[PDB]
Amino acid sequence: GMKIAVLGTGTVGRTMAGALADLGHEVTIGTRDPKATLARAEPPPFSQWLPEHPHVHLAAFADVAAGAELVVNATEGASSIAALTAAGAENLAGKILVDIANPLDFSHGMPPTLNPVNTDSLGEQIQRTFPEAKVVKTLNTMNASLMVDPGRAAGGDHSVFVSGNDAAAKAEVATLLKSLGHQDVIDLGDITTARGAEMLLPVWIRLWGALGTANFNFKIAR
Amino acid sequence: GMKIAVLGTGTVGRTMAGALADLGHEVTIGTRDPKATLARAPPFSQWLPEHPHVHLAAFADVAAGAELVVNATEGASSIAALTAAGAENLAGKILVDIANPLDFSHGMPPTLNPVNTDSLGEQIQRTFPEAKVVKTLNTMNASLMVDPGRAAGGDHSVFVSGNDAAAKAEVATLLKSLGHQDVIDLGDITTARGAEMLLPVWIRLWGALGTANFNFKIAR
Numbered sequence: 001g002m003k004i005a006v007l008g009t010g011t012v013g014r015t016m017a018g019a020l021a022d023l024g025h026e027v028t029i030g031t032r033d034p035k036a037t038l039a040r041a042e043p044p045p046f047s048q049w050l051p052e053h054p055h056v057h058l059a060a061f062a063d064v065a066a067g068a069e070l071v072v073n074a075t076e077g078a079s080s081i082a083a084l085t086a087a088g089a090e091n092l093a094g095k096i097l098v099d100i101a102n103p104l105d106f107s108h109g110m111p112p113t114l115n116p117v118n119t120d121s122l123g124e125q126i127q128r129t130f131p132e133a134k135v136v137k138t139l140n141t142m143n144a145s146l147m148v149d150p151g152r153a154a155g156g157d158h159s160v161f162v163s164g165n166d167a168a169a170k171a172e173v174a175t176l177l178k179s180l181g182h183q184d185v186i187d188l189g190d191i192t193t194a195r196g197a198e199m200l201l202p203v204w205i206r207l208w209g210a211l212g213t214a215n216f217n218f219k220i221a222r
Numbered sequence: 223g224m225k226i227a228v229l230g231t232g233t234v235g236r237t238m239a240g241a242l243a244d245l246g247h248e249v250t251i252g253t254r255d256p257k258a259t260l261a262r263a264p265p266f267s268q269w270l271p272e273h274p275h276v277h278l279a280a281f282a283d284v285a286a287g288a289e290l291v292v293n294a295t296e297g298a299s300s301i302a303a304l305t306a307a308g309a310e311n312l313a314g315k316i317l318v319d320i321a322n323p324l325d326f327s328h329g330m331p332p333t334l335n336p337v338n339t340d341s342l343g344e345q346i347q348r349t350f351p352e353a354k355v356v357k358t359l360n361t362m363n364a365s366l367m368v369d370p371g372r373a374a375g376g377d378h379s380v381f382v383s384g385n386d387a388a389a390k391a392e393v394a395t396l397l398k399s400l401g402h403q404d405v406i407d408l409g410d411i412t413t414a415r416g417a418e419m420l421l422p423v424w425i426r427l428w429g430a431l432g433t434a435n436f437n438f439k440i441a442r
């Protein structure tokens with residue numbers, strides 16, 4: 001197993017950290033301030049989740065990234081650059097950075113829109129801000145539940161995408177995705193293909209409304 | 223059998239016009255200038271005689287006589303094509319919008335304009351407020367719009383976006399007649415944003431898979 005740092009204490013971070021730990025990886029979870037995160041009483045609260053996953057350990061973004069071989073970005077999209085900067089470019093250099101964030105924009109009305117979008121992407125922004133990291137955009141196109149148990153929606157009949165400049169990095173991420181139950185991994189190409197992957201979110205949001213559930217997924221039929 | 227006007231002489235317009243004529247509809251195909259179009263270089267002049275029931279005429283002349291109108295024009299020019307068709311000829315009728323507002327001004331692959339906070343489907347609806355705009359079929363290759371069974375046995379999804387639920391219901395019936403068994407109503411015309419925004423990944427999937435013979439399926 002690998003030493004994996006999951007930056008994010010929300011549903012995605014918890015879901016991924018728990019699943020990766022169950023697969024035999026040594027998993028740490030990154031947060032801005034561990035004391036503040038553990039002190040949160042409002043919901044569930046992170047302090048109620050952590051005791052159920054005894055093999056997972058909490059620390060600040062910089063501390064978890066420095067100790068990990070591979071890093072997973074599961075932070076709020078609008079804050080991902082800030083989170084990763086706090087993690088430290090020096091702690092990301094030469095390592096695979098799995099980017100699951102969506103750059104949702106909740107500033108000017110509902111449902112959210114994307115920023116950046118179309119001619120740019122959060123995946124690209126992360127890669128050019130941290131040029132020595134090996135960014136792989138993946139898993140952002142489905143509900144957290146399906147990232148680790150895709151079988152819950154239509155017997156696991158679905159597609160997952162990878163985007164990234166380093167083919168060897170994408171191959172390693174594909175192996176991890178397969179270990180999580182994803183049998184159809186499609187390589188969209190370089191990191192600029194994160195634009196199309198991120199741009200699936202607007203229809204995802206409308207499908208959630210139209211279908212009355214987040215238990216659905218995209219399948220590329222061919 | 224409805225009177226359908228298909229605005230567009232490219233692969234989408236030809237494919238849709240031919241399929242609808244084969245289904246029993248009285249189909250007309252719209253172009254800017256019939257004389258100029260037939261004078262080109264397969265060429266439209268060779269396609270047209272193979273579909274004798276389909277009639278070619280100017281945009282304004284096909285829309286006036288039609289009961290339902292299909293937009294199959296270049297996305298960047300759709301507002302101009304429909305303006306030429308005439309707002310008076312679109313009033314009270316279903317306007318099926320298949321166009322994608324691809325933007326080729328800054329190289330390849332194309333991006334979208336409008337995008338994100340706006341869509342071509344919305345632009346069309348607010349420019350022609352009395353038309354009943356329904357965004358659909360823009361998310362797949364022309365071949366699959368009329369014969370979806372060609373890709374993975376037809377296991378795919380098609381979307382409808384539009385403000386008028388009765389208009390969407392009529393379009394859903396037409397889509398079913400074309401072989402689309404899974405029609406998903408995304409909601410109002412602003413949901414055309416998500417439908418149009420599937421194109422960037424579509425373009426990369428075409429490159430990644432080496433074929434246009436694929437489709438989106440929403441598994442649930």
Ligand SMILES: NC(=O)c1ccc[n+]([C@@H]2O[C@H](COP(=O)([O-])OP(=O)(O)OC[C@H]3O[C@@H](n4cnc5c(N)ncnc54)[C@H](OP(=O)(O)O)[C@@H]3O)[C@@H](O)[C@H]2O)c1
Pocket residue numbers: 007008009010011012013030031032033037074075076077078079082083100101102103104139140141142143144145
């Ligand atoms: N919800 C889903 O099922 C789903 C599906 C696909 C993709 N995504 C994407 O996955 C990401 C995570 O979503 P989520 O719902 O689990 O959590 P989230 O609420 O979007 O993000 C919470 C995390 O972001 C960090 N964060 C928030 N503001 C920050 C800032 N100012 N500076 C640095 N870090 C900040 C938090 O740090 P602290 O720990 O210190 O609070 C926390 O770790 C998002 O980008 C989302 O769009 C979510």
Ligand SMILES: NC(=O)c1ccc[n+]([C@@H]2O[C@H](COP(=O)([O-])OP(=O)(O)OC[C@H]3O[C@@H](n4cnc5c(N)ncnc54)[C@H](OP(=O)(O)O)[C@@H]3O)[C@@H](O)[C@H]2O)c1
Pocket residue numbers: 229230231232233234235252253254255259294295296297298299302303320321322323324359360361362363364365
């Ligand atoms: N290719 C596909 O399988 C596919 C799939 C899904 C959606 N779409 C969308 O479907 C639409 C049609 O695509 P296409 O490849 O069949 O044809 P296209 O090349 O995009 O469009 C050709 C049509 O647009 C009209 N047009 C071009 N410039 C115009 C202008 N300045 N003013 C008025 N009309 C103008 C042409 O008029 P004339 O007849 O006078 O030349 C012609 O009828 C596009 O929006 C495209 O994005 C295509």
Ligand SMILES: [Cl-]
Pocket residue numbers: 021022052053054055056
């Ligand atoms: Cl554990």
